[PDB]
Amino acid sequence: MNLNSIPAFDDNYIWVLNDEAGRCLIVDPGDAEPVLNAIAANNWQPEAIFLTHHHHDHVGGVKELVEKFPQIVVYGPQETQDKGTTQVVKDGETAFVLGHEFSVIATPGHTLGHICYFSKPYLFCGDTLFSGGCGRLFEGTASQMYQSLKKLSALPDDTLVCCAHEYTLSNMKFALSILPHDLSINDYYRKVKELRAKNQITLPVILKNERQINVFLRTEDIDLINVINEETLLQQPEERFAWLRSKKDRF
Ligand SMILES: [Cl-]
Ligand SMILES: [Cl-]
Ligand SMILES: [Zn+2]
Ligand SMILES: [Zn+2]
Ligand SMILES: [Zn+2]
Ligand SMILES: [Zn+2]
């Protein structure tokens, strides 16, 4: 398969995988217009849409896409049944698309019903995991997001993190506000700053690298533990997650 990105709105990406014949899988199409344009420009043959969660910026384009291409199957969680899903998927299920079996992983936190899709190496993790960050907890608890990120981080090292928003630079500025001396975070911040200064996409990222630069994946890293403890004594990695997530909310 071949990966493509379609920008939408201010900072969304609509990921598309295509096979050699041009059949395609479209992930979280919040705006149909750039998707329809890309389908036509590339002569793609739409097969499926994957939805990760119910927010407008991920689902708004479904109706128009399926009107133009009624053959599309729309896979999504129960919380998207009223957003155009025609095949519900749940934790531990799979969807067979473009000749590949995608695993479905429930990741409550950003929304309660958020799911991620994985077919090695591609991880479509929506708004759960971002490069350098994680989703805001609009519906779920910090415990849920902590457990969700633990599952995603346990995927293979070569996983390509295909998240939905170009938030990487802001995420790294937050990281430096917590760990200003951390060399890996500083180096990745500079790389990202330069990509964005040239208007270049920062995604996808390799999970092995991501774990080293993402404070939300580092709650057992002694360096982060120690810096947090200079302000608030915390012994549980899950507590460090909630402390970080609340700090980021205010940043
Ligand atoms: Cl809104
Ligand atoms: Cl978010
Ligand atoms: Zn393959
Ligand atoms: Zn969202
Ligand atoms: Zn909104
Ligand atoms: Zn979003």
Residue 192 CA from chain centroid, whole number: 17
Backbone dihedral region of 28: left (phi > 0), alpha (psi from -120 to 50 degrees) or beta?
Answer: left
How close is the Cα of 210 to the center of ligand 3, in Å? Answer: 23
d(CA 59, CA 93): 21
Give CA separation, 209 vs 40, 179, 233, in Å: 35, 17, 28
Rg (CA), the chain: 18
- For residue 181, how far is its CA from the centre of ligand 5 (angstroms)? 34
Q: How was this structure determined?
A: X-ray
In terms of DSSP bridges, do strands 94-97 and 87-88 run parallel, antiparallel, or are they unpaired?
Answer: unpaired
Measured from the Cβ of residue 51, the count of other Cβ atoms closer than 10 Å reads 29
The residue ranges of DSSP E strands in 51-157, in sequence order, are: 73-76, 87-88, 94-97, 100-106, 115-119, 122-126, 129-130, 133-134
What gap in Å lies between CA 245 and CA 141, rounded to an integer?
A: 10
The pair phi, psi for residue 99, each rounded to 5°, is: 75, 10
Place of tokens 């499926």: 48
CA neighbor of 36 nearest in space, from 16, 10, 12, 56: 16
Residues 6+ apart with CB under 8 A from 177: 247, 251
Can you give the CATH number for the domain in which 45 is found?
3.60.15.10
Task: Determine the structural domain holding residue 111 and report its residue range.
Answer: 1-251
Query: Ligand 5 centroid to 172 CA: how many Å?
Result: 22
Which residues have CB under 8 Å from 197's CB, separation 6+?
Answer: none
CB-CB neighbours of 75 under 10 Å: 25
To 5 degrees, how large is the angle CA 184–CA 217–CA 13?
A: 90
The secondary structure of 35-49 as a DSSP string is HHHHHHHHT-EEEEE
Domains contained in the chain, number? 1
Q: Which of 94, 88, 92 is nearest to 105 (CA)?
A: 92
How many residues are given for the chain?
251
> Positive or negative, the Cα torsion across 138, 144, 145, 149?
negative
Q: For residue 49, what are the contacts with CB-CB under 8 A and spacing of at least 6?
A: 25, 26, 27, 29, 62, 65, 66, 72, 73, 74, 75, 76, 84
Ligand nearest to the CA of 164: 6
Spacing, Cα 121 to ligand 3 middle (Å): 9
> Tokens for 6?
């379609």
Residues with CB under 5 Å of ion ligand 2 are: 127, 135-136
Q: Ligand nearest 216 Cα, by number?
A: 2
- Please give the Cα distance from 157 to 177 (Å, whole number): 27
The beta-strand segments (E) located in the chain are: 2-8, 12-18, 23-27, 45-50, 73-76, 87-88, 94-97, 100-106, 115-119, 122-126, 129-130, 133-134, 160-163, 205-206
Angle at 36 between CA 32 and CA 38, to 5 degrees: 120
Q: Residue 84 — left, alpha, or beta (φ > 0 → left; ψ -120 to 50 → alpha)?
A: left
Instruction: List phi, psi (to 5°) of 109.
Output: 160, -70
* Annotated binding-site members for substrate: 136-138, 165-167, 245-248
